[PDB]
Design a protein around this nucleic acid. Structure first.
Ligand SMILES: Cc1cc2nc3c(=O)[nH]c(=O)nc-3n(C[C@H](O)[C@H](O)[C@H](O)COP(=O)(O)OP(=O)(O)OC[C@H]3O[C@@H](n4cnc5c(N)ncnc54)[C@H](O)[C@@H]3O)c2cc1C
Length: 450
DNA sequence: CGGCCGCGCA
DNA sequence: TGCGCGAAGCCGAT
């Protein structure tokens, strides 16, 4: 079950005498992981062990206790899963560019393998690691069903050009996973404690000093991810087609935090949803979201390295937004007023409070939320900066290609078309308070989140 | 040339 | 709550 098009050489070299090392980064799971499975196969043909290495950087300081604890509790459970497969795991601290190089030398590695991410910083680390090693280095796309570089060889302007190219390749690339074969040939607790202490003075607090974040909505880890997948199929999938854009209903999958950390495979989710007997419109709507919209977000970041900037917007949108730079805004809020939910719009404020208290804003209100940031900020650049700052600080699923592609759709028209013409926002598709009012029970959502 | 919200009306 | 239109630009299959 090993298609060669899932893997490519980052660097050629002379293979070594030691273990195959899988540098895990994006795909924090033992099951349904093409990068670990390929590493295990290479190790088996060479008659040597496989081992896993993960580098804990100082990036955590830029987000919060909420993401750091979600990731680390998962990693504690993963450490135990890999051990039942007699696969050892090593947890390094510091800059990957230096630390993965040094580990490959200190540990006498034969081959290095990593998983795939289109984000800049991963590419920076790979470049540094390449400069400091002499062994072969491969990349495996463990996150997408169709490998990103195979689905398309260029940036796609719309879902409607990407969709036929991806779907033509599903009969080949959508397949079951083989079982991971076991090997035959300081603590994370201390790291968690130290990290939580370092972040404690910047934690999200109410006026009484009691924390805003509520950790009981999504329990972390590979076993919990699977339980959420299974309850989506049993209890929420049937009504997904009708209710996915109603934020007063809990009818989304709730999978995004697990998908973001790679605690569950999207290919796995697609296999199970394809085989579920349920509402045909719901299945089609859901599969289009997890296949086309998710995988087109990797396409966007992979072929546009300025993906978090105004430069990445399409020309029609840059030309429209530029012409409206001098328009008076109805309101202007600072980062801190947006963050504390202190606008004049109670629907906007409630969306921000759902984000602060749960770490997961409903998908429909994320669109509305980001578009009002544009409408009530000094400039398009300040808008993009504020939405990215709050998305990445407070979403459990943030710092993700879906986030940059979703924010760029909302603010800059990426994967959209010119739609209407207004002051400030020009031809960027508009969404209104009264528009929401006639689609769902706006007052119920506001009451639920203060 | 084909084909991707808010308002009015059941 | 569901459906069709309005007011509309651009990429890519020809
Ligand atoms: C302004 C804005 C910011 C966003 N930020 C993020 C983010 O930081 N991280 C993130 O994962 N998603 C982001 N999204 C996309 C989307 O809103 C979330 O993925 C979704 O709400 C997660 O909830 P769910 O898994 O229950 O969704 P479901 O409806 O159950 O969908 C299942 C999966 O399909 C994919 N998906 C759904 N919608 C989109 C979309 N619009 N674009 C790309 N993939 C999609 C996701 O992988 C998602 O988990 C953002 C969208 C917008 C408009």
């Amino acid at each position: 079950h090993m298609n060669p098009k899932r893997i490519r050489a980052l660097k050629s070299g002379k293979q070594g005498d030691g273990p195959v090392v899988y540098w895990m980064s994006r795909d924090q799971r033992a099951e349904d992981n093409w990068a670990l499975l390929f590493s295990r196969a290479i190790a088996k043909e060479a008659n040597v062990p496989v081992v896993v290495v993960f580098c804990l950087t100082d990036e955590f300081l830029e987000a919060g206790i909420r993401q750091y604890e979600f990731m680390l509790k998962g990693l504690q459970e993963l450490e135990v899963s890999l051990s039942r497969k007699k696969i050892p795991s090593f947890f390094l601290r510091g800059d990957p560019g230096e630390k993965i190089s040094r580990f490959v030398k200190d540990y006498n590695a034969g081959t290095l393998v990593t998983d795939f991410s289109p984000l800049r910083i991963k590419n920076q680390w790979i470049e540094k690691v390449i400069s400091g090693i002499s062994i072969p280095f491969f990349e495996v796309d463990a996150h997408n069903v169709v490998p990103c570089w195979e689905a398309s060889q260029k940036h796609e302007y719309a879902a409607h050009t990407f969709r036929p190219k991806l779907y033509a390749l599903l009969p080949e690339f959508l397949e079951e996973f083989p079982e991971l074969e076991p090997n035959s040939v300081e603590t994370l607790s201390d790291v968690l404690e130290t990290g939580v202490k370092a972040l404690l003075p910047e934690r999200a607090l109410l006026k009484n000093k009691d924390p805003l974040f509520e950790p009981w909505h999504f329990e972390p880890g590979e076993k919990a991810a699977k339980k959420v997948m299974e309850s989506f199929i049993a209890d929420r999938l049937d009504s997904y087609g009708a209710l996915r854009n109603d934020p007063t209903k809990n009818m989304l999958s709730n999978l995004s935090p697990y998908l973001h950390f790679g605690q569950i495979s999207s290919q796995r989710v697609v296999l199970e949803v394809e085989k579920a007997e349920s509402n045909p419109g719901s299945k089609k709507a859901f599969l289009d979201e997890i296949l086309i919209w998710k995988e087109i977000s990797d396409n966007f970041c992979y072929y546009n390295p300025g993906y978090d900037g105004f430069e990445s917007f399409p020309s029609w949108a840059k030309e429209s937004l530029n012409a409206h730079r001098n328009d008076v805004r109805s309101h202007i809020y600072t980062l801190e007023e947006f963050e504390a939910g202190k606008t004049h719009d109670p629907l906007w404020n409630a969306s921000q409070m759902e984000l602060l208290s749960t770490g997961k804003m409903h998908g429909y209100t994320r669109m509305y939320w980001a578009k009002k940031i544009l409408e009530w900020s000094e400039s398009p650049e300040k808008a993009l900066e504020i939405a990215i700052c709050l998305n990445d600080r407070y979403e459990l699923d943030g710092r993700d290609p879906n986030g940059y592609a979703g924010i760029a759709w909302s603010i800059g028209g990426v994967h959209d078309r010119a739609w209407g013409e207004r002051e400030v926002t020009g031809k960027i598709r508009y969404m209104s308070y009264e528009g929401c009012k006639r689609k769902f029970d706006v007052k119920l959502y506001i009451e639920k989140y203060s």
